[PDB]
Design a protein around this ligand. Sequence first.
Ligand code: HEM
Ligand SMILES: O[C@@H]1CCCC[C@H]1CNc1c(Br)ccc2[nH]ncc12
Length: 371
Amino acid sequence: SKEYHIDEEVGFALPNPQENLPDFYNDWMFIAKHLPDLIESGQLRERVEKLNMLSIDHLTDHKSQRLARLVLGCITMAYVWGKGHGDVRKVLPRNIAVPYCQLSKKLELPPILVYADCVLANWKKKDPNKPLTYENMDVLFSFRDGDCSKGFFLVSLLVEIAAASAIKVIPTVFKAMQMQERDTLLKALLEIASCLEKALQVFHQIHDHVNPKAFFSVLRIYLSGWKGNPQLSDGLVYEGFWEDPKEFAGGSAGQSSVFQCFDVLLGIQQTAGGGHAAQFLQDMRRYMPPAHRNFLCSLESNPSVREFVLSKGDAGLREAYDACVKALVSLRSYHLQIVTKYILIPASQTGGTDLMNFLKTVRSTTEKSLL
Ligand code: HEM
Ligand SMILES: O[C@@H]1CCCC[C@H]1CNc1c(Br)ccc2[nH]ncc12
């Protein structure tokens, strides 16, 4: 898949993302590539204003459109938030707002940096013939020196990549149900659990490469959007595309497919019930590349793995299925311990308690799916 833009090695990540744009877009790339220096020094805004409007007709393929969305998205964060100390721009200059929106509408994504921009497309191998480890990778873009954006985006990415090993097993799960091959199904559920158990270890790198004070006080400010944000009460003006201001949520891993596809597969109904948690997760499918959205649809349309397992009186399938739910819980528990360290504690020196409660609701709903 192919039709679902899922790579066998990296899964939902864009494989081998492009680093360079056609020379026709060097004006864009000169800004995006030196944001630390241009923001700190005060030139970034003036430079986005002194930019000519450029067509998107010269972005041939998908890997190039995605790079451009990533260049334009980071530039728009830097323009809107400035040095990241509270001086806000509420108008995105038409000379950049129009191509960012035009390109966005092409990709059916919103004109704002989303998870698939700053994680899934925002990386590269150092030596392409070595393996995908932290030490052999880097990000393409950052916002400020010391904002810990490499460790944050890459460790999220390395977790996505570790989840890839399980994603490629989902076909065999539904096929084993169809063909009623109980042994094949059990082996597939235990292999899915095994890969999600391994993906926990990967999360541990977050402590080595991200510092709480930098993440809370700097990176978090540049990932923020303008949806129910008091600093832009009623959103951001995309000059020359909308006369009205438009609200768009900031980047969030609630735009991720890596856990959502296992929730869906296992019948953990994170999106049911009407609550705030399920509203957010459903609203956030809009900020997900369409092929990945479609993929979660296809999963939701398949016969329930949970129903199959429960209908069969089979302790071993029930344990294999609990092995996957448990592994999701372990990850979300580790994840909540990270949010305590990187947000709750730093803030005591979109609110802290609202975000922990969202994560707790998702965790509790994973917990409740065990047998
Ligand atoms: C410094 C490290 C991290 C912090 C502070 C952090 C914080 C958060 C917060 C506050 C949310 C709530 C949704 C939102 O506010 O957008 C969230 C959601 C989420 N984050 Fe993280 N995160 C971190 C690392 C990671 C990593 C490395 C991954 C691995 C890919 C990850 C995966 C997720 C997922 C899947 C969700 C959606 C809710 C769920 O499925 O449980 N996060 N994160
Ligand atoms: O709302 C949260 C407030 C604090 C800054 C992050 C933001 C969540 N956004 C994320 C991005 Br972008 C990339 C990877 C992620 N992993 N987990 C969350 C997450």
